[PDB]
């Protein structure tokens, strides 16, 4: 029986995800821009943060 972080707040912009975000605990977020240019990102988020 395991973890789960509160859902994100998806916000639209022009080819851009603003994401007001607000976890319970430090959450490792990460992505993969699916181009052959990967351009991934990693950051533990414990403090609520609007990201892009």
């Amino acid at each position: 029986i395991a973890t789960l972080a509160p859902e994100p707040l998806v916000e639209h912009k022009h080819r851009t995800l603003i994401l007001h975000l607000h976890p319970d605990h430090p959450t490792l977020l990460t992505t993969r821009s699916l181009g052959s240019d990967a351009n991934p990102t990693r950051q533990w988020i414990e403090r609520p943060t609007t990201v892009n």
């Binding site: 029986i1 789960l4 509160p6 859902e7 707040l9 007001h20 607000h22 609520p48």
Partner: protein
Amino acid sequence: KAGSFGDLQSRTSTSNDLYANTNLKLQRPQAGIVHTPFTQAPSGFERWK
């Protein structure tokens, strides 16, 4: 906005009506057990303090 200040917005204390954008989203209870997953932003009154 939920999480932001004023997620709960009651006119006064007596006012039974209000505005609660808390993004309250129930999820199914796990593995055949009685409980109530309520997934929710802690308040914009919790922050703001």
